[PDB]
Amino acid sequence: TRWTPTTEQIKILKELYYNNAIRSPTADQIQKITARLRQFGKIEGKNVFYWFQNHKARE
Amino acid sequence: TRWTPTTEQIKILKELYYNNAIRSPTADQIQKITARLRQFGKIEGKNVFYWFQNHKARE
DNA sequence: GTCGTCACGTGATGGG
């Protein structure tokens, strides 16, 4: 079904977005970010892709 | 506004519900559970009450 | 002590 981020994963994403101004990550970045997040859960590239797109759209 | 459980809190609640068969916890238990969960976030007894009420109903 | 309902956040898409 649908992806649900660990809070730990959210900490990583939030750190990239706010502390590092990563808002529209490139393909290379999505794959590296995905590797990082997989330590804490199942996760695909598209999960990380949609997350930045949605969080950007909403901030 | 509304409470958002951290993953580690969700680990604790499911662990009490399924592994300890606590499904309509008593008041003393609600207070004890809240104390434990507060280690991981802001939390009030009424959150834990609603959580069991909601999880029991929808299971 | 149960049920129905709301309120809201958010993952997931599609269209242009």
Place this chain on the structure above:
DNA sequence: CCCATCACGTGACGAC
């Protein structure tokens, strides 16, 4: 790229 929805889980109530 950005927009607008959709899908849906779920914290909160109210009522009884």
